[PDB]
Structure 1
């Protein structure tokens, strides 16, 4: 029954919020809909894999909050293998390379590629992390999809192909599905194109030893019987002195305040009294989550390394089930594995097959790209399709279709009376990651503390010291990168030097 704060949701965000409020001497209850905590992170354990993350996994420099939290819970990171060459597979052929960027040799394609990445970043500088609807060209950019934007900017098919893959991999959605404003904000608040795409010095640098599910698992240990499992919340009543929150198994909770720490759309699954205000009522019908299946194929040895390949594959094409892969072997070097993501429309299309049919298709693909018959000989396979989760709605995260971010965006983390909103979607730095879950959980926890007069307004938003274990190298550009023209800028320069 009665407590200080009810947290709806036992994913990283809700658990971080509860822990903070608990740590502050308040009585919290976490109500988790599933028979586990973790939400979009999930470590499966078994003899064949030891452990493996089937959802949220990677951490990297600038992700200082998740790293501080995990370290406090006794967890360690190891670095994702990137010692040997990466592979860009283009028109049925593999081009090994080194560096975070695939080489381009043809100087036109080179200028177009430079300009595109450059422009993503230029455009994002104009977008406030905390209020994207405030950018000078907010409406113009929100009225376009990423598809219209890519069409306008890429004067080569090669750059349009790679840029399309980048969007697919980043937000698990098609270019034509998502707002250009929101996708530009998304990349910008992760610290930019380079930080987001990179393994070394980027978001995929590292993974927790033992899996990321331990973050939520271990907080639940600390909270004990304050975490209630298999309590899906169905009803919130704020008409009375204390807030009433009812679960599906008929239990009633009573708090001073509530943190909603679930995806914004999953708010639909709760009936509200009084009804939500108008803009929230409509916002939650407008914010879908992407589509992905995460796939891990196991082998006897990491045989790719022998050919001087780290196991990272960037795979152009419609034919390819998977556009990107990473070595998923353990830091000890056993349980050799390749991780791959089936994204967006391919998630929807290949869901129709059986587990055995998907495995075969990956192996056959990976045998082509890597040039290795050994890829046809896996020992184990695990996969999770996040599209089927009633209590996620999809993965990695929530995306905004055109016209929504500017009409409805400010509503996302606006309190409704005594409810406050956490969840990775309400973060202003690495929103959509395990990092933004933390930021938002802890932030919404401090908003409630402020409401009670325990802390000043000053202290609701709070900066994080940099990890001494995972420090960030700065993102640098060369002079040529900054000043090489685009294609149309070269064409205009050819136009001028003549007349």
Structure 2
């Protein structure tokens, strides 16, 4: 019933917010729609897999908030396997390599690839993390799709295809679905192209021992009966002295403030009194989430390692259901597995099949790419299609179609009277990730602490000390990477 703050949503962001407020001495209640916490993180446990992350899983250097929160909760990380060679599968053929980037051998193609990645980061440097709509060319870039940008930038089909895969993999959406400004912001605020795409020294470096779901679970343990499961919020009334929050199961909660810790568009599931301001009213209809199926195929042994393959596959082409895989074997070396993502339109297309049909397609693909008949003998399979989730809307995160970020972006975390906004979408560093969830939840919590006069304004946004366990190596470039001309640059020189 009555409390200081109601947090709507028990994902990592809502839980991080609730924990901070609880630790500060406030009475908090978390209202969670599902029969579980964790939201876009979910760790399944059974005998066949021990545990498996079916949602958010990967963490790495520069994600210091999620690492600090998890450590405090008693969790540990381990390193995703990248000892052996990676594979780039191009036009029906596998090409093993080392380092974060699949090599290019044709000279013109090399220049084009080099320029593409470089230009992505160049453009990102002009985009403020906390205000992408303030980029000098914000409107120009927001009014183009990533498809249009790639069409302009890539003078080779090779570069265009790999860039397309990159977009699909990053934001689980098609290049023609997303704003160029938004996508460039997204990459920049994860620390740039190298940082986001890398396993070693990047966002995919590590996983939590026992699963990422433990973060939300362990905070629920700390908060006790303050977390209310199967309480979907349906109504928020701010017309009176205290805010009134009503749930589907006919309960009423009364609070001084509310944190909305749900995906922006899922604010549509709540009826507001008074109505939301115009800009937020329309914003929450303009911000869909991506489409992905996360699939994990289990094997007797990590057989790929014997062939000097680490399990990472970058797989070109329409026919391939999965464009990207990582080794998902346990740190102990058992429960051997390959994790793959079915991305964007392919998640839509292949959802029509049965679980068994998808397994067969994945195994046959992996057999081809790994050049191993062993891939045809799975021992177990788990998958999760996030497109079906009423209380997520998709995964990994919210994307912005052309024109939306500039027109509506400033609304995202603007308070509405006594409602403050958390959720990974509102983060300024690793938005879209578990790291962003923690940043946004803790910032939203501190906005309320400031509103209550408990902390000064300059304490709302707080820096995070670097993890001692997961140190970040700086991202470097070579002289030639910096100064080699683009394809049109070479042509102008000629």
**TM over 0.5, shorter chain:** yes
Residue of structure 2 in register with 1:217 after alignment: 217
Equivalent residues in 2 for 1:70-85, closer than 5 Å = 70-85=70-85
Question: Displacement, 1:157?
Answer: 0.2
CA displacement, residues 256-287 of structure 1 (integer Å, 9 cap, x when unaligned): 00000000000000000000000000000000
SS at match of 2:458: helix
Partner Cα distance (1:229, 1:336) in 2: 34
Question: Displacement, 1:196?
Answer: 0.2
CA displacement, residues 130-186 of structure 1 (integer Å, 9 cap, x when unaligned): 000000000000000000000000000000000000000000000000000000000
CA displacement, residues 433-467 of structure 1 (integer Å, 9 cap, x when unaligned): 00000000000000000000000001000000000
CA displacement, residues 230-269 of structure 1 (integer Å, 9 cap, x when unaligned): 0000000000000000000110000000000000000000
SS at match of 1:409: helix
Partner Cα distance (1:103, 1:181) in 2: 28
Partner Cα distance (1:120, 1:458) in 2: 32
Equivalent residues in 2 for 1:224-239, closer than 5 Å = 224-239=224-239
Structure 1 stretches (4+) deviating beyond 3 angstroms? Answer: none
Partner Cα distance (2:306, 2:482) in 1: 38
Question: Displacement, 1:383?
Answer: 0.1
CA displacement, residues 276-322 of structure 1 (integer Å, 9 cap, x when unaligned): 00000000000000000000000000000000000000000000000
Question: Displacement, 1:351?
Answer: 0.1
Residue of structure 2 in register with 1:137 after alignment: 137
Partner Cα distance (1:107, 1:352) in 2: 42
Question: Displacement, 1:478?
Answer: 0.4
SS at match of 1:95: strand
Question: Displacement, 1:210?
Answer: 0.2
SS at match of 2:181: helix
In the alignment, structure 2 segments of 5+ residues that lack a partner are: none
Question: Displacement, 1:338?
Answer: 0.1
Residue of structure 1 in register with 2:121 after alignment: 121
SS at match of 2:236: strand
CA displacement, residues 377-409 of structure 1 (integer Å, 9 cap, x when unaligned): 000000000000000000000000000000000
Question: Displacement, 1:102?
Answer: 0.5
Residue of structure 2 in register with 1:497 after alignment: none
Partner Cα distance (1:389, 1:458) in 2: 38
Partner Cα distance (1:374, 1:107) in 2: 37
Question: Displacement, 1:337?
Answer: 0.1
Partner Cα distance (2:373, 2:223) in 1: 49
Question: Displacement, 1:350?
Answer: 0.1
Question: Displacement, 1:66?
Answer: 0.1
How many residues align? The count is: 494
TM-score, length-scaled by structure 2:
1.00
Residue of structure 2 in register with 1:487 after alignment: 487
Partner Cα distance (1:144, 1:155) in 2: 18
Question: Displacement, 1:10?
Answer: 0.1
